[PDB]
Amino acid sequence: SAKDIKDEKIQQYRKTLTKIVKIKTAIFHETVKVTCSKDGKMLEWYKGKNDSDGKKKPIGSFPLNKITSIRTKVDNLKSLEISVSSVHISTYLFTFKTREERESWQNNLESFRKIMSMK
């Protein structure tokens, strides 16, 4: 757009949005590198373990505009429970090894979400 608005948010946030975290779903629990899509509409994640990936591709990213609530796991501040409008799959848990690491993530992603969902 200019230096801030449409594309720029995607490029800017994507950098800080990329993190090695532990994903926890009904389908699979896999340590993964979470980043934002090149389109900026979804949150794309690539296996962040090593070679023990059970997809050999993105494990099945979801669109950020479907998120219904993003809050830190109230019983575990190192984890993040993200409720999203989802199909066959459980609520998405973004889990880090420390709070400070995950803290930065929601701070960024929530605002990026606010640009799209709270637009």
DSSP string, 36-69: E-SSSSEEEEEE-SSS--SSSS----EEGGGEEE
**Judging by DSSP bridges, how do beta strands 29-36 and 92-95 pair with one another?**
unpaired
Go through the chain and tell me how many residues it has.
Answer: 119
Q: d(Cα 90, Cα 12) in Å, to the nearest integer?
A: 29
Q: d(Cα 39, Cα 32) in Å, to the nearest integer?
A: 20
Q: d(Cα 22, Cα 13) in Å, to the nearest integer?
A: 20
**Both structure tokens of 52:** 């023990």
Residue 74: strand, helix, or coil: coil
The conformation of residue 102, written as its DSSP 8-state character, comes to H
Return the residue matching tokens 């230096």: 3
Q: d(Cα 92, Cα 107) in Å, to the nearest integer?
A: 17
Cross-strand partners of 21: 32
Q: d(Cα 66, Cα 1) in Å, to the nearest integer?
A: 23
The conformation of residue 12, written as its DSSP 8-state character, comes to H
